[PDB]
Amino acid sequence: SDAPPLTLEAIKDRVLYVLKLYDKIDPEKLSVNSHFMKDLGLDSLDQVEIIMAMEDEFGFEIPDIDAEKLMCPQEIVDYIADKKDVYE
Amino acid sequence: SKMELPDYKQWKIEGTPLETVQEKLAARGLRDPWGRNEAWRYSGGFANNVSFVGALLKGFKWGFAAFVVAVGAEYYLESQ
Amino acid sequence: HAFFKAMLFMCSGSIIHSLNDEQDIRKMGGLYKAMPFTTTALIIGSLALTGMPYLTGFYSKDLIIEAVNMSYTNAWALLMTLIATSLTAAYSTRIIFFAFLGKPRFPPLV
Amino acid sequence: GAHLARRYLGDASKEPDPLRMPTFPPDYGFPERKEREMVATQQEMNDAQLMLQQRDYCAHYLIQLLKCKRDSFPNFLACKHEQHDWDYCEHLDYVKRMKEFERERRLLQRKKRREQREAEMARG
Amino acid sequence: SGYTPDEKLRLQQLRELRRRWLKDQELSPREPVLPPRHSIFAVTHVLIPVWIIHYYLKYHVTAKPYTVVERKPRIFPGDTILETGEVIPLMKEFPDQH
Amino acid sequence: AFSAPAAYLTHQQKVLRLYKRALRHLESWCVHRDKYRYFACLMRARFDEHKNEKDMVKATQLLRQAEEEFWYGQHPQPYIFPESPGGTSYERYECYKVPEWCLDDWHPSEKAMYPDYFAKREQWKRLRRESWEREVKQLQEETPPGGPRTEALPPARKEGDLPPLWWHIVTRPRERPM
Amino acid sequence: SFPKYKPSRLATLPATLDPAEYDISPETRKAQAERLAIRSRLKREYLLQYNDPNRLGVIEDPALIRWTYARSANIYPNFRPTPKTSLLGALFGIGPLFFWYYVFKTDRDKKEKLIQEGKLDQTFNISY
Amino acid sequence: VHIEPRYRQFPQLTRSQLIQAEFFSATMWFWILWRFWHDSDAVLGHFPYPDPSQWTDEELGILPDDE
Amino acid sequence: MLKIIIPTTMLLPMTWMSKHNMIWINATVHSLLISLISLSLLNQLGENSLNFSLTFFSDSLSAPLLVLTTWLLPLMLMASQSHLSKETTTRKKLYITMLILLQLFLIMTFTATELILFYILFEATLVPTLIIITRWGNQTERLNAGLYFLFYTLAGSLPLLVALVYIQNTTGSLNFLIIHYWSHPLSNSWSNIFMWLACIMAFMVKMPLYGLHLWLPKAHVEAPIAGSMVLAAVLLKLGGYGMMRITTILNPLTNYMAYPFLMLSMWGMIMTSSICLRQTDLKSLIAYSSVSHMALVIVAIMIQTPWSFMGATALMIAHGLTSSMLFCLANTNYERVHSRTMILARGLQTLLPLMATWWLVASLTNLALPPSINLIGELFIITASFSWSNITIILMGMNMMITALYSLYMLITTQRGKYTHHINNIKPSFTRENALMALHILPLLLLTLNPKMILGPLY
Ligand SMILES: CCCCCCCCCCCCCCCCC[C@@H](O)O[C@H](CO[C@H](O)CCCCCCCCCCCCCCC)COP(=O)(O)OCC[N+](C)(C)C
């Protein structure tokens, strides 16, 4: 049929996967609750690039006003889960 | 069904045009931190692809072999 | 024209359905090997459209062009027809090149 | 194409006019011209219902081709000799038309040059 | 930058409620409680309509003049007419430009 | 679409939005991935060259010039994601979205099928009925006397309350309803 | 530096190219604050009745009623006979009628005059 | 026929689709070659185009600028 | 023909003697039976009309109108009972009495053999319609609407009466048969010109003519659904019937007196079609549609050719049915949401699919889709006008482009898009409304099957 019913663990796995290929982010130091500015020491442009990478990966656009607020991978996972009605 | 993502450390910009991009940016003092993300588009089974002329001549070998054997049959069938 | 036009549209629809309803050719990567039957069909249809000899588009378009070239007609219309039949191959080449050749450009979930 | 360039850029006074052609009478340069003969009768052409544009001096070959096409219906690859003959005699008709065009062109240029030369002789 | 604690808490509670509602949309195993030959297609879709059409054309449409008109068949030199048996003569001794 | 807008856009927000738009349009121009990476790194260098301008006036002038250059050199046919407001699947499924209150008009024969679902629906309706008054009281108490100044709503705070005005957000039809 | 873009009636000026939004004053910030305040008040009013469990029917919108009433019933009471109004009314209500009358009268006079001379090619003109 | 997603790997291909595509490309090229071998005149022209300059004046019949 | 007149006069006391809960059933069943009885008038001759007696006669132009009226009464009864549920028994009986009297007056109007009796009945039809509009209208404007309905008519009809009696003192009779057999030419004088105007302006204001149409939107918007149905379907056709009957004595003056009316009709057709594009009200759109169609009918009657006459008759019948259906369709949504604004309730196809199908069929028939009788009449009129003058195909063509637009616009505004979120009182459509729509639409296609019966005596 069509694409499978995306689940929460898959979303989190993809988010951490795409974040671990970023050269400015340490893989070991990166956690699902890590803060981009505080814990990882990135600026706003790096956040914009990360959000653009998420848009490219999952194939849907995140509005700017909603995009600025995301700061940790858990926030991105929650936003994507709420957007696509993923509940399991 | 029930398939997990591959390892993330196998993706390397080495051997792909991303290496040339990084070398060009290194001469300018800059860097490309997203090459490893794009390495999968060149790494595996997508490593090579045909050209336009080569794409047009997809089944030319088999077709020409069939044409040659058919022509040979025709030449040595009118001899009746 | 009905045959190969409908078939080219069906190939385009197959490509669209495969790539999660994506229609922009700028996100259409290397489908020459990933979609062999679709690639074969689209290449054959593009060749038939361009008046490749002894295909379906040849037996009508070739005679149309050769009848226009040998009639008491407007010269500007003849020149425009020739430029148009070159641009036909131009845009067919654009479709094939951007859709089937090169490296993937679609989202990673294949 | 060169004829178009010659008529539209060069001197068009010695170039034939396709709409107004011929401008010379048929027996001017010829001591005698044979009348072109037609092989198929009006009634045969009417009964075959060829078309108003296919009823030229070539209709006999077309009638033969249609008859052999109808006779050998399922074998649609058998009427090659008749088609070739019809195409050949069409080609002969076309060559005759080119001959008429070239004759008219040289007639016009020769007549105009000879008139200019006679006027020049009468002007001196 | 980012959320404020009120926004984070509201998003949390709304997400829990939305997930509960989405879970409730699932169907229990019994939910749709419904209350209480080979070539037949070619007979009732081809044969019957063509029988009716042939009857109507043969016995009603053709009963009036000029209702069905066919163009006259082509006649060439050399055929024989079916009715009168007339044979059409040959065609004027081809010049034979072989 | 989910966050309450603010009164105005800050200079940092405007610069970030210009950065995103420029990068996306450059990707639209640079079809291939390696070329896009090269020119995106060049664009990043251009953007962070003037990151430390202490005078806001010159920063806004640079922003003005960047907007003018972007408008002149923008892609006339930029890439749009399929479900974005300019995409080919923007509002495709809006014909399949039906509000929940329609289920109140079903014939009892129709409701005979799916009994458990309608029991759960009755549970949810009773919960909404019981929590509406507390939601209204909380909104009344938290609102400033001059009325609300933004569109942000408070969360729940007491023992078992629900966030005010939650019914029509929680009970969204779906993204792919039918 | 680059060619300029000039707005038109049917192709307006973009927000990012508006000079008025790059030269700001605290008065403009206050005005934006009031705008957001009114919008938030109206949104709260709408959402209070939107979520009411006991509400059955249509939430009446005073803005829609105002729009329809202004478009339909409020026009004549605010109409004054001015040179502009009278001239436009006379033009758009009289000029087309006389123009079309002249066109059709001329065509029919030509047709009748051709008929009288007997040269119209009226063969097979049975149905009329 | 069941095929699962790959996530950054080449998609799974069945033998049947490759066989079909290769067969159809081969048959198209065979048809083109066979038709050109049997019907070349449809492409290269069948009857020679004459040059009007080589036509003698006797057969076209114009007087030699005398009368 | 008293076999049809007496049953209505019997409908009156039958309604007034019924039980309090059986008025609607009895009225509907016996109105349907009377329609079935009136179906027999369609057996017409080819040379002369059915001259029943010294007082009544039936032509092939009035028989379809009688059938349409007798068919429309049960539809009005079906539509009216929804919003009159809270009304008292006596007032419901009075409303049914008004409807019955209107049908009776129309029936005797379409078959009067003499012009003065036809005038008397054609003017007597004013009272029940005005009473209905003013008494059972919903909003405060109804009063004014009634006034606009009344005087606009009377100012046009008062001179006609004078002209009529004048004719009786000149030719000695007003009987239609004697008038037709003893017709004499009208010379070109001022007295004859004013006689022409007096005889014509009443039916011009009834159609209505462009510039004289300001009463129609008021009357058709402020009236109840039955009132709107009766004004749109039948009452507008009185002007056309009268013009067709009266133009027998106006020749050859009409040959040049039709120019101002032809120009008004064509340009106002274009103007009203343009008006329909920008309309915030749904009933006014249908009203201006009616104005455009009746302008086409006026053109057809004025050019005075057999093809134009047939097209005019077919167009009147088709327009009556179509406009009645459109009004009922709009009234369903109004009863749902209590507002006539078009953009209030949207996306109704998601909520009411079969009603969306009814809307689609009604709008397709409105824009003259072939082979409906709407397009038959429109095309006959267009061909006759082309014979009149070749340039007409411009203006008509423009109309044929604009009309469809607004039609589909209405549909796209009401049925498509996304539903209004705050409207949650949209109940599923009742069997009554669906039956009303089906009874509106099926006779249209049935008449399309046999179109020779609405093409008038010129057939
Ligand atoms: C908003 C819409 C309302 C309805 C509109 C209906 C239109 C009614 C107009 C009536 C049309 C024709 C009326 C008069 C017929 C001829 C017109 C006349 O003006 O033309 C010349 C007439 O010459 C002069 O014009 C005389 C008329 C001048 C006085 C009339 C005033 C015109 C001003 C317009 C006022 C608007 C009238 C309508 C008010 C609503 C013709 O020359 P002539 O051959 O000698 O006269 C023919 C009659 N004969 C044979 C008896 C001799």
Ligand SMILES: CCCCCCCCCCCC(=O)SCCNC(=O)CCNC(=O)[C@H](O)C(C)(C)COP(=O)(O)O
């Ligand atoms: C394809 C055609 C269009 C492409 C053309 C695009 C041209 C644009 C290039 C030129 C743009 C500029 O230089 S405009 C440079 C703007 N300069 C400033 O704003 C100075 C103050 N710095 C800050 O505000 C923050 O540090 C900030 C920089 C926002 C970072 O934010 P974060 O660190 O907190 O994430």
